[PDB]
Write a protein that binds this DNA or RNA. Structure first.
Ligand SMILES: [Mg+2]
Ligand SMILES: [Mg+2]
Ligand SMILES: [Mg+2]
Ligand SMILES: [Mg+2]
Ligand SMILES: [Mg+2]
Ligand SMILES: [Mg+2]
Ligand SMILES: [Mg+2]
Ligand SMILES: [Mg+2]
Ligand SMILES: [Mg+2]
Ligand SMILES: [Mg+2]
Ligand SMILES: [Mg+2]
Ligand SMILES: [Mg+2]
Ligand SMILES: [Mg+2]
Ligand SMILES: [Mg+2]
Ligand SMILES: [Mg+2]
Ligand SMILES: [Mg+2]
Ligand SMILES: [Mg+2]
Ligand SMILES: [Mg+2]
Ligand SMILES: [Mg+2]
Ligand SMILES: [Mg+2]
Ligand SMILES: [Mg+2]
Ligand SMILES: [Mg+2]
Ligand SMILES: [Mg+2]
Ligand SMILES: [Mg+2]
Ligand SMILES: [Mg+2]
Ligand SMILES: [Mg+2]
Ligand SMILES: [Mg+2]
Ligand SMILES: [Mg+2]
Ligand SMILES: [Mg+2]
Ligand SMILES: [Mg+2]
Ligand SMILES: [Mg+2]
Ligand SMILES: [Mg+2]
Ligand SMILES: [Mg+2]
Ligand SMILES: [Mg+2]
Ligand SMILES: [Mg+2]
Ligand SMILES: [Mg+2]
Ligand SMILES: [Mg+2]
Ligand SMILES: [Mg+2]
Ligand SMILES: [Mg+2]
Ligand SMILES: [Mg+2]
Ligand SMILES: [Mg+2]
Ligand SMILES: [Mg+2]
Ligand SMILES: [Mg+2]
Ligand SMILES: [Mg+2]
Ligand SMILES: [Mg+2]
Ligand SMILES: [Mg+2]
Ligand SMILES: [Mg+2]
Ligand SMILES: [Mg+2]
Ligand SMILES: [Mg+2]
Ligand SMILES: [Mg+2]
Ligand SMILES: [Mg+2]
Ligand SMILES: [Mg+2]
Ligand SMILES: [Mg+2]
Ligand SMILES: [Mg+2]
Ligand SMILES: [Mg+2]
Ligand SMILES: [Mg+2]
Ligand SMILES: [Mg+2]
Ligand SMILES: [Mg+2]
Ligand SMILES: [Mg+2]
Lengths: 50, 112, 77, 100
RNA sequence: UUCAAAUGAGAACUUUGAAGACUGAAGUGGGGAAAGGUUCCACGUCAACAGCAGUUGGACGUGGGUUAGUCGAUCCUAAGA
RNA sequence: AUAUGGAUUCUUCACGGUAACGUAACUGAAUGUGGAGACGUCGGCGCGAGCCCUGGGAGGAGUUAUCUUUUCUUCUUAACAGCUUAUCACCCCGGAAUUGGUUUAUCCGGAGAUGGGGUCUUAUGGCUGGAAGAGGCCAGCACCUUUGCUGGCUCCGGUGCGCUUGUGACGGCCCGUGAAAAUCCACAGGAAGGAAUAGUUUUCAUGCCAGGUCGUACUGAUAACCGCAGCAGGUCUCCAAGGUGAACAGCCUCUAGUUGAUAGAAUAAUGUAGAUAAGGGAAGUCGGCAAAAUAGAUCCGUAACUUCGGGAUAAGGAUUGGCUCUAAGGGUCGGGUACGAUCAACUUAGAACUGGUACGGACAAGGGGAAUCUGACUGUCUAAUUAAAACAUAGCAUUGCGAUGGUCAGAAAGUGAUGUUGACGCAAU
């Protein structure tokens, strides 16, 4: 790191954006069935292999 | 006691990453990076640093007036005077003995 | 980056086309071994270098400043 | 090449609050100012007095304003007067004794 | 390791002050390369997690942050591809 | 992109210097050539830088029963630019035996020494500009406030087998001689172009516009990486203060940084880790395993045997604190064409005195000897039960081969390794 290719920074960015809790208003929709965000990731529990 | 870090990202001691310690107006020590030293141009004949000529790293020679790149005799910045002394002498003497060979071997052709 | 001593040359700088601003600095300084004296550095900001001319003789200094172009934007102190 | 030097102390501020005695004070100088290593040796080489409201040291020998400060700190220390009185520089070589 | 204050429902463990020590510049200091990828910083904050604890955190929530004509890449060639 | 100034020209493409070479400039196509880029390693010697030590002075701080003109701390100067600055090298004068000059290190001179005069590179340093207006250190007023405001001082020195790093002129080594290319400059050349009623010149000065794209946070580890983890493991590097001491050792300290790691009470057995033990002294045990003993430095003394290099710190001995003295070892100046005067350094040896005979006082720090077996040696391996006598090695000897070739690769081939090779070679034992 510390000096990255733009491709990697890009992925990096896309993966920051995905790292948020479920938006609670979805829980209210007719037939909604998603309890929580089941694809959450943490930097010190699962490495993202680039 | 005041220690000091590199300034560019390269952490290794390579010939392109020499450092100089320096005392700033802030009253502190700071590293400065240091360009590799320039070497003296050399005579094309004999090989010694030729005198009268500035010494810079190569691209720096295009930011410098032509007087910094010569002395004012024949083959100025190129070969070294003593070497040009030799060049002249030998040139003369040889062109001379050419005339000698011509007329000697010419006479061969007239008595043989 | 330049120092200048020819008080004639100096003037000619300050009337150059590119010269919009200037500045006069004053320092206390001491002379020889004993007493003090009032040093004055005349700085002309040229386009690519700052010319500065030092007049130790405080006398020369005054009737220099009144020579300064009435159009030059001088910075006093 | 010999050089004489002047040192003033403005002892007004704490003299005027009763707690300072310019008297025995300039005596303290008189008594402990070491000259080539010894007390009371300042034989016509260092003169000391008290213009009523101001003490004055005049020296021809090894003497620094740092030393002066070191002495009267010991005085002020001697007579319980620290907490209350600072030796201080105002202009160079002209010193005062601040109260509060 | 210790005393006390502060905070907090709650303090062996947080914060601040004080004291006692340690690393001892071949560092428990000050920076970087690979690798990580936001962990940086701020505010909020303890259900899980940090094999006692927790008011603290590299945890959780919400935000902010990475400025170049000169520093690197970019150009050149090396083994090689 | 370009004008203005300068320079140059009626002797068109500058002058000056005997010369080394000088400079603000001082046309130069094809082509050719030269230089830079560009290069190992270790040794001592010389200089730089920053750090270390330190005197005076001007400030602030600490200690002050007593003592200390004291202890601690601030006193700084960037890139860049002008001038100046150098070991080396080179030039001119000169013509050398009574050979001289000369490095710590023995090299140099009739292929021109020593001497005297000069030319050069600008590493590096100095002075000035940048620049005191910055930053650093203080004091004196102001007041919930943004937070000000006002004054000062920021000076002059010293020392060196110091420490780190830099660089130079040298020297050692090699069957080892220690990259490439982009890129920049120069020279040889002289195609060509170019003035007097006015031309040539942007490698001299000044002036104008522009410089995109991506990275840039933080960690870098007894918690930001790899080991299923906040794992006593593993993971490339730069900076580096004071004392003791040979020392980047150990031990203590400043700057910075920590004070993390469940906690309380007790101190049974048996443990793990750290020590001691009378008299004896390996009787223990497969086996001195473990442990103990030794250790620095100075001096003295030192066997067999040997490839003469060793063996060797062989072995064996004395000595070492504190304090007070003595003696030897240097620099710098002026001397008509013998000495004087001053400033600055820890080494070494001698001599007193002194103590519960201690003194490398902690730390640090070799047990020695006589033989047999075995491998010559240094080196190498079974990551995770074998480090050895095993492997390697130099040395010795044997084999194959002159290219239409030897040995080896490939399914094939206008295929490939040795081969940038040639028997002082390559290949195989
Ligand atoms: Mg991990
Ligand atoms: Mg950096
Ligand atoms: Mg020249
Ligand atoms: Mg030159
Ligand atoms: Mg605790
Ligand atoms: Mg310690
Ligand atoms: Mg150490
Ligand atoms: Mg730690
Ligand atoms: Mg970092
Ligand atoms: Mg990471
Ligand atoms: Mg944080
Ligand atoms: Mg809880
Ligand atoms: Mg956790
Ligand atoms: Mg827990
Ligand atoms: Mg809990
Ligand atoms: Mg968060
Ligand atoms: Mg966020
Ligand atoms: Mg660059
Ligand atoms: Mg590019
Ligand atoms: Mg001219
Ligand atoms: Mg070429
Ligand atoms: Mg070449
Ligand atoms: Mg190279
Ligand atoms: Mg210091
Ligand atoms: Mg630079
Ligand atoms: Mg000479
Ligand atoms: Mg001459
Ligand atoms: Mg090094
Ligand atoms: Mg060589
Ligand atoms: Mg050149
Ligand atoms: Mg023709
Ligand atoms: Mg130009
Ligand atoms: Mg383009
Ligand atoms: Mg950074
Ligand atoms: Mg960490
Ligand atoms: Mg995993
Ligand atoms: Mg670990
Ligand atoms: Mg840290
Ligand atoms: Mg534990
Ligand atoms: Mg316990
Ligand atoms: Mg016993
Ligand atoms: Mg015995
Ligand atoms: Mg037995
Ligand atoms: Mg026995
Ligand atoms: Mg038995
Ligand atoms: Mg046995
Ligand atoms: Mg037996
Ligand atoms: Mg043993
Ligand atoms: Mg014993
Ligand atoms: Mg023996
Ligand atoms: Mg003795
Ligand atoms: Mg002596
Ligand atoms: Mg062996
Ligand atoms: Mg061995
Ligand atoms: Mg094994
Ligand atoms: Mg196996
Ligand atoms: Mg072994
Ligand atoms: Mg043999
Ligand atoms: Mg074919």
């Amino acid at each position: 790191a510390a000096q990255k290719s733009f491709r990697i920074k890009q992925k990096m960015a896309k993966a920051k954006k995905q790292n948020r809790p479920l938006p609670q208003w979805i829980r209210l929709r007719t037939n909604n069935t998603i309890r929580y965000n089941a694809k959450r990731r943490n930097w010190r529990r699962t490495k993202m292999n680039i | 006691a005041q220690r000091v870090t590199f300034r560019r990202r390269n952490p290794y001691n390579t010939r392109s990453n020499k450092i100089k310690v320096v005392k700033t107006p802030g009253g502190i020590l700071r590293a400065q990076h240091v360009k590799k030293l320039a070497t003296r141009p050399k005579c094309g004949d004999c090989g010694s640093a030729l005198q009268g000529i500035s010494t810079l790293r190569p691209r720096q020679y295009a930011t410098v007036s032509k007087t910094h790149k010569t002395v004012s005799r024949a083959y100025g910045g190129s070969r070294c005077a003593n070497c040009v002394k030799e060049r002249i002498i030998r040139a003369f003497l040889i062109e001379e003995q050419k005339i000698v060979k011509k007329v000697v071997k010419e006479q061969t052709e007239a008595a043989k | 980056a330049r120092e200048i001593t020819d008080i004639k040359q100096f003037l000619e700088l300050t009337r150059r086309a590119d010269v919009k601003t200037a500045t006069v600095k004053i320092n206390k300084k001491l002379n020889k071994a004993g007493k003090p004296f009032r040093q004055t550095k005349f700085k002309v900001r040229g386009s690519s270098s700052l010319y500065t001319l030092v007049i130790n003789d405080a006398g020369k200094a005054k009737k220099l400043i009144q020579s300064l172009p009435p159009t030059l934007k001088v910075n006093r102190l | 090449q010999k050089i004489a030097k002047t040192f003033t102390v403005d002892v007004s501020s704490p003299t005027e609050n009763g707690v300072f005695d310019p008297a025995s004070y300039a005596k303290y100088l008189i008594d402990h100012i070491k000259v080539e290593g010894a007390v009371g040796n300042l034989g016509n080489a260092v003169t000391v007095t008290e213009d009523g409201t101001v003490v004055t040291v005049v020296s021809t020998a090894k003497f620094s304003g740092k030393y002066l400060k070191y002495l009267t700190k010991k005085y002020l220390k001697k007579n319980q007067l620290r907490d209350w009185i600072r030796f201080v520089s105002t202009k160079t070589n002209e010193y005062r004794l601040a109260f509060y």
